[PDB]
Design a protein around this ligand. Structure first.
Ligand SMILES: CC(C)(COP(=O)(O)OP(=O)(O)OC[C@H]1O[C@@H](n2cnc3c(N)ncnc32)[C@H](O)[C@@H]1OP(=O)(O)O)[C@@H](O)C(=O)NCCC(=O)NCCCC(N)=O
Ligand SMILES: CC(C)(COP(=O)(O)OP(=O)(O)OC[C@H]1O[C@@H](n2cnc3c(N)ncnc32)[C@H](O)[C@@H]1OP(=O)(O)O)[C@@H](O)C(=O)NCCC(=O)NCCCC(N)=O
Ligand SMILES: O=C([O-])CC(=O)C(=O)O
Ligand SMILES: O=C([O-])CC(=O)C(=O)O
Lengths: 435, 435
């Protein structure tokens, strides 16, 4: 009855035509200009990609297919007795552009439970990895190793016509999303619960709930946090490091497994997703140096030392946002409702009153406001997940939803190889005159 | 006496200033414009990155720090009694911009022999991988797993000042290049020479020669081919999928190991480096269907069928070149000197007279000429390396030289996070009016 694949089959040809015509009329229209500073500056401010699933406004933050976070909270189906949106529903919205029904949502949940299964070579590999290998590296290696199972890789090798690429990318996408929590939970248990098992999938629960059970958490509020977490970290337009990496690698026709693993190596960067872990380590040194209940003057001193030592203050600033991240707000709000008296929370709250000011005073950051990473780990710590080197893995699990939803569309729309032109400083000087 | 690290220490501050001033004067100068078609077209034709090591001219092909392939052949140091350039020398040129002395070259060779050593967890992992796991996937997973050894990851975690990033990236770069051939050779032996050992590094040989010995090849001409192969596949400006992926991931501060593994997942794409393998599989079906000595009319038919089935003809076309790739020419020339009567070579030569014509007739490809991938495997097959699913691994090994040479410079120059702005079709329509 419900079948996302049949819905996409109808949607595809219509978008194809729409884009065709628009390009007929405006393909040559100029949308911007490229300056020397932009090339030197990591393409800052260059409109360079088409990415359909979400769009980020510098002032307002993220919109998923046109809806803001509050809107999603309000419109997406929730679990029975739940308050937080189910990520299954978000996935539906990203892929189709339509708010799903609860019936649609449960189908997604069953599909994902049905496809969750790991091959033994992956299991062995994880089980044989050393404990000093970072969780993200263990994750990226496992997903890379899962490509032996790719249906897209296989169909390509069989010579399938390019028009059908999307159908195979869709299947690998749904298989990958299904498997992710098992890989992630296996890493968690091996490293932190040595000798225990992740157990089995219950085809009757939502994806978030089977994940938390594999992680070994019983608290129902924890289940709720995970639903919210997994929904909000899902996508953030196409230019962010991880989504752009998946997009660029996927453009070459590498399979979804290879494309997502590469993305993961981009998310593990300190300036990207690893910031969530970096925030907790910075907070821990803080409370350690200064000891728990600090004065404002002492916090400022602490921030200045970081700055003066040639380092960044993690969880603050953004390449495109210019105001406080609604993802940060959304987390604050969860904390105020559920763990208002937590001391770490209280510390994060205090920093909100100080860090921006210090950053403004320094005068280098364009955006002195916090980003999602400044508020995430604090919530996780409260429930007992104190292993901070594992936090980025949660972000990776969520990010699969967004990048994979777009990957289907990239192939459906026939986007070609991403291949811009590069320049040397010497060549660029000549192009202009020099300086 | 020779110490690349000391040479870079002098070079860095001077480039830093040069770029500073130029940007002072021309930062706001416009170098191009962005159109709708470019955003939809994988940034085709957009000048979007600064990449110092090599620059590609659409007509003339690649230049490494200003030198063309023939120039390199002629200027770079060769092995005693050799004719082909040593890749060690190319690495020196890319990193410093200067042609090295043979003495400099040997230092590079010793450094690389000294640093070649694998940790046991990597060894185990490879040894436990299944034979149906693609060689590239085995490679990318191993490099990802090697990050436990990253000196950059470690220094970052210790809070090093951003000004010293390059020094740690340099060390991981030289360690990674050193280790690559051992990882690659281990994959080769496990898959195709089960029960044998790669053996040991001889600190007295060039990198290419220790690699071929680990692969188990004795032919001296094979050693020569490998030197040439590894030199020519080294770099191809910054916008190619693999180099751009390494650049983008590295921009987030992920370590060289993570950045190169991600690049490898991009090189494994059929539209990128896997084309080398794809060419040999296409040639094998050819000679199989048509049987060895084909008529021109039969070859055309064969090409048309591929085209008509919604597939690409591998080894032809390019995102930026508009003429025959000098890398292809350079290989042809090697074949004419060493294996002129090889039947497969003869087939490749015949296709040169037909494929372009067919592509032009079809009218879709912008560049109907061959690229490097159309001539590489044929040479490898001649010497006995007939395992075509492993060819891309050789390309990866070579590509480390270029991307890693630039990675050092990216951090030395303080390039920031690569983060362009994306757009949805709907948002873009509105920006203009629609169509
Ligand atoms: C996120 C980001 C990399 C954005 O980079 P950008 O767009 O290049 O930032 P920008 O235009 O404000 O940078 C201007 C200057 O301010 C500095 N600055 C910016 N944010 C800073 C921060 N939090 N702490 C210290 N310095 C900072 C920049 O590093 C740069 O200095 P430089 O000229 O000497 O290089 C940056 O704000 C940063 O480094 N933040 C800290 C790391 C972090 O929290 N990352 C997580 C982002 C969210 C996510 N998960 O991806
Ligand atoms: C290399 C490349 C992806 C360049 O892509 P591009 O810059 O998008 O190519 P383009 O502007 O000529 O494409 C225009 C049209 O011609 C088609 N075309 C281009 N090269 C083709 C080829 N070899 N066979 C069939 N069709 C081809 C394109 O796929 C496209 O058709 P579409 O409009 O229906 O999408 C393309 O030429 C190709 O697919 N080649 C075959 C694969 C290959 O040899 N890759 C190796 C490249 C070298 C390397 N190692 O990276
Ligand atoms: O938008 C970006 O550049 C980074 C970010 O916050 C995300 O990827 O979630
Ligand atoms: O230049 C490109 O886009 C691809 C290519 O030939 C290479 O990476 O060697």
């Amino acid at each position: 009855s419900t079948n996302l694949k049949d819905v996409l089959a109808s949607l595809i040809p219509k978008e194809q035509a729409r884009i065709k015509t628009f390009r007929q009329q405006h393909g040559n229209t100029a949308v911007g200009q490229i300056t020397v500073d932009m090339s030197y500056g990591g393409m800052r401010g260059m409109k360079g990609l088409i990415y359909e699933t979400s769009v980020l406004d510098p002032d307002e933050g993220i919109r998923f297919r046109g809806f803001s976070i509050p809107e999603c909270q309000k419109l997406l189906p929730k679990a029975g007795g739940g308050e937080e949106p189910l990520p299954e529903g978000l996935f539906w919205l990203l892929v189709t552009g339509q708010i799903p029904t609860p019936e649609q949502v449960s189908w997604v949940s069953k599909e994902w439970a049905k496809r969750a299964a790991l091959p033994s070579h992956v299991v062995t590999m994880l089980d044989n990895f050393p404990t000093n290998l970072h969780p993200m590296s263990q994750l990226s290696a496992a997903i890379t190793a899962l490509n032996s199972e790719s249906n897209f890789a296989r169909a390509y090798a069989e010579g399938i016509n390019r028009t059908k690429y999307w159908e195979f990318v869709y299947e690998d996408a749904m298989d990958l999303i299904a498997k992710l929590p098992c890989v992630a939970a296996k890493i968690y248990r091996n490293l932190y619960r040595a000798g225990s098992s992740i157990g089995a999938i219950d085809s009757k629960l939502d994806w978030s709930h089977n994940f938390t059970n594999m992680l070994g958490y019983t608290d129902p509020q924890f289940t709720e946090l995970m639903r919210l977490y997994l929904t909000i970290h899902s996508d953030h337009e196409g230019g962010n490091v991880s989504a752009h990496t998946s997009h660029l690698v996927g453009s070459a026709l590498s399979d979804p497994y290879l494309s997502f693993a590469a993305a993961m190596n981009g998310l593990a960067g300190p300036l990207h997703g690893l910031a969530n872990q970096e925030v907790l380590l910075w907070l821990s040194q803080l409370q350690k140096d200064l000891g728990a209940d600090a004065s404002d003057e002492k916090l400022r001193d602490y921030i200045w030392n970081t700055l003066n030592s040639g380092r960044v203050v993690p969880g603050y600033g953004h390449a495109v946002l210019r105001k406080t991240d609604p993802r940060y707000t959304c987390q604050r709000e969860f904390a105020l409702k559920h763990l208002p008296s937590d001391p770490m929370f209280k510390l994060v709250a205090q920093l909100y009153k100080i860090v921006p000011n210090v950053l403004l005073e320094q005068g280098k950051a364009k955006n002195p406001w916090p980003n999602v990473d400044a508020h995430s780990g604090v919530l996780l710590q409260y429930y007992g997940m104190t292993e901070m080197n594992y936090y980025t893995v949660l972000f990776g699990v969520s990010r699969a939803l967004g990048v994979l939803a777009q990957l289907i569309w990239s192939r459906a729309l026939g986007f070609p190889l991403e291949r811009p032109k590069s320049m040397s400083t010497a060549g660029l000087e000549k192009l202009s005159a020099g300086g």
